[PDB]
Amino acid sequence: LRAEQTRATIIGAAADLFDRRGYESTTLSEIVAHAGVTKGALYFHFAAKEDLAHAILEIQSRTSRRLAKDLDGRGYSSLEALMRLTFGMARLCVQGPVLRAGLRLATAGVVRPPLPHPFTEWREIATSRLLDAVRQSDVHQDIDVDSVAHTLVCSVVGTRVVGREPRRLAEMWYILIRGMVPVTRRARYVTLAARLEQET
Amino acid sequence: EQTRATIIGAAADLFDRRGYESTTLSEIVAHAGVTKGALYFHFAAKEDLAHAILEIQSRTSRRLAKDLDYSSLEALMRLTFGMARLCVQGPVLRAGLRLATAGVPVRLPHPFTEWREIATSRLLDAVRQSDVHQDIDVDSVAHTLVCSVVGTRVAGREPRRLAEMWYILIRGMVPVTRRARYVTLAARLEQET
Amino acid sequence: LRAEQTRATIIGAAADLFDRRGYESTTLSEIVAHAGVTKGALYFHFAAKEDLAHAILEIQSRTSRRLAKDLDGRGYSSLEALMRLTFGMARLCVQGPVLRAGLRLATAPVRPPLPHPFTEWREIATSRLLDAVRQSDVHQDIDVDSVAHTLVCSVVGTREPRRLAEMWYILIRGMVPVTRRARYVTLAARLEQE
Amino acid sequence: LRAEQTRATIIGAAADLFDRRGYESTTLSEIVAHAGVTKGALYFHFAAKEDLAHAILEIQSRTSRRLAKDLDGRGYSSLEALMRLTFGMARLCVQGPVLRAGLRLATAGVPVRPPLPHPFTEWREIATSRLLDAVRQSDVHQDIDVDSVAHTLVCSVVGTRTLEPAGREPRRLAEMWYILIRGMVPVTRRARYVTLAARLEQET
DNA sequence: ATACGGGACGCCCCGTTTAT
DNA sequence: ATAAACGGGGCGTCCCGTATGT
């Protein structure tokens, strides 16, 4: 209402700090200052402050699945999905901090079910989208699919990536494509990555 | 001192488990046997424990790097594997990454742009000596190597992870011939458990 | 209002929480929570948290009267009336959730004019005691107070009429001329819920 | 150290406040204001503010049988002890706000933590004992229902009153005694007490 | 009278120096 | 390495009035 307008602002302003400072070290009032609200306006929306943690993870674990849908019957090859998908994730990290923050909160456990825990969400989404891309040839039917997925996930996670980071993800792809996709396929994809990094 | 190791050992445990920011002195002092005054006399402030943990790491980092004697790519390969073996060998070193993950306050060099700088030096030397193709881009590779060595957890699949990732690096990076040694090498370092 | 039913039931849960949690130990959160009522419903009815404490003392003192002026409706002896009352009043607090609270808030800020219940009570026992002296049931020599301090804790320092009778026994024995102790004691005995 | 000074001061401060204004309704800030200490000085000595109440209750229950003790060495018996024994507590009530807050805490909420020495089933005891021994000294009547009188006694001892002006406190108890004698005491020797009360009023 | 927003503190307790 | 004291917020939440889109 005026309610969501605020409720959002808050998460906004919280996700900014949480990303730049940590759950732990962001003052519950450095938030209510930086979102221009009041303790009690905040309170209506968030009683505890892992009510913020939680609703910030909430969004990430959601809008991930919302991109996983936004490109299927969009006519894409298995890999091309999973790849473009990650530039999608990378898309928003770059613009507005909610996601930026959600990543940083996946070192909190400030994890209680049916909360996402946002890694199986991705392992499984890639352990699948890969285990599928070894179908349309496109991979190598010799590879340990599971092991690559486990990698991909931090590979993604980065280090000042833990930007300029779409850029990084781009290279990461390259390093991974070369020596995962067969000789010929490397075409479609290297170009795919460079173009994905250009605009995403 | 002995008690000085004791305060850190306790501090590092509680840190890597509860986090720095929410580990209180009371609890460190508590879970250490040492008095509060004892604590403060050894270190000036809560952060100084955080410093002195980064110290152990950043130190014994190079203490392992001291074991260059060896293919530039091999040291670097093995360096990984050893480093990972350690980040389990007690809290101290493990808690070092934990403090790195969080808001690092430093000064010490810098936490990862030590590591990444190392990765590069080795890789540059590998390229200097044919083991790695000239027109890979080292830093792109340094970086990704520096990250990927977090995996996902940040629990037996650990060499079982590097090994596998090293392969992917080898497959695009190294010459086609020299490629083989380095793989059976990675298989073998995985067999240090 | 017909839909005062709410205000009845707001005070209902309000009163119960007070004599269990306490006054401020009890929060609006839990009152409306308990009540089965919106905050806003409560604020339309009462103005502020004290207004509920206030609303309660009122319900109490409006039974001090309501019940005192219905004993001296009968043909009663003043000193009889007086003890009659010290049993009625102490029987309500035995089972009234709304007056238990009345007590609990008396012990722990009463809005004027309302006279702090205790002094209300003492000047009533006085009133009646002084009457019974004129009737000659109580000796003409004893300092009327004595009074209401006695009879309060008898709940507060938590079957109990048996203790309330007990104290009459002691009182009657010292103030009521020797002749007339008969009646009152037998009556005090009789006044046990029965 | 003269931590004990502050430590004690705080409890003065707290008891004075706890007495005038209730437990619930006194702030740890009004307390630090009053004892002139800093929040962390108060914290050293008391973590929770229940500690501050439980330590006051203690300092009160302990202070009472220190009067069950001192009032022996055949310093009377049964009624005579019991009688001045009360007057003594009422004597400290009159100055030490710590004792005042003592009762103020029994009536309101006395919070959790082991054990909380319940100040009443304490007194029912000390009294039923002391009284039920003046049956054994025909200072009472064989007929008098001892346990009924203890509950009565303790009850009226608390009185209510500031609901009524402090210092008129042993004054009350004086009357309350008077009324109880008569009711309970052999005619033959009510004397001994009526004097022991009205003199004993101004001095305990 | 609903939802929403508003401040105000209360308590806890935490990371530290003086008395030493 | 003391025991005692120190301020300084953190979070929670409480008791309330201005806008209110069910």
Residue numbers in the entry:
A (entry chain C): 5 to 114, 116 to 167, 175 to 212
B (entry chain D): 8 to 76, 80 to 117, 120 to 166, 174 to 212
C (entry chain A): 5 to 112, 115 to 164, 176 to 211
D (entry chain B): 5 to 165, 170 to 212
Lines quoted from the article behind this entry:
In S. coelicolor A3(2), a total of four proteins CprA, CprB (the coelicolor pigment regulator proteins), ScbR (S. coelicolor QS receptors) and ScbR2, have been identified as GBL receptors. The structure revealed that it belongs to TetR (tetracycline repressor) superfamily of transcriptional regulators (TetR-FTRs) comprising a DNA binding domain (DBD) and a ligand-binding domain (LBD) at the N- and C-terminus of the protein, respectively. The DBD recognizes and interacts with the cognate operator sequence (OS) through the helix-turn-helix (HTH) motif, whereas the LBD regulates the DNA binding activity by interacting with its cognate inducer molecule. CprB consists of 10 α-helices, among which, three of the N-terminal α-helices α1, α2 and α3 form the core DBD, with spacer helix α2 (residues 33–39) and recognition helix α3 (residues 43–49) constituting the signature HTH motif, commonly present among transcription regulators.
The crystal structure of CprB in complex with the CS was determined to a resolution of 3.25 Å. The asymmetric unit of the CprB–CS complex consists of two CprB dimers and a double-stranded DNA. The DNA sequence used for complexation was semi-palindromic (5′-ACATACGGGAC*GCCCCGTTTAT-3′, where the asterisk represents the dyad axis) and has been previously shown by Sugiyama et al. to bind ArpA as well as CprB. In contrast to the apo form of the protein, which is a dimeric unit, the CprB–CS complex was found to be a dimer of dimers. Both the dimeric units are bound at opposite sides of the 22-bp CS and there are no interactions between the two dimers. Comparative analysis of the CprB–CS complex and the apo form of CprB was performed using LBD domain as a reference frame. Binding of the CS to CprB induces a general pendulum-like movement in the overall protein structure as shown in Figure 1C. A twist in the dimeric interface results in a coordinated motion of the DNA binding HTH motif about the connector helix α4. This motion facilitates a snug fit of helix α3 into the major groove of the CS, thereby aiding DNA binding event. The ligand pocket volumes also change from ∼635 Å3 in the apo form to ∼750 Å3 in the DNA-bound form, indicating that the operator-bound form of the dimer is a more open structure with an increased accessibility to the ligand-binding pocket. The average of all the roll and twist angles in the DNA are around 0.9° and 35.5°, respectively, yielding a global bend of ∼3.5° in the DNA as compared to the standard B-form. The CprB–CS complex is stabilized by a total of around 35 phosphate backbone and 20 direct base contacts, shown in Figure 2A and B. The direct base contacts in the monomers are mostly through the residues K43, G44, Y47 and F48, whereas residues H49, Y47, T42, S33, T31 and K53 interact via the phosphate backbone.
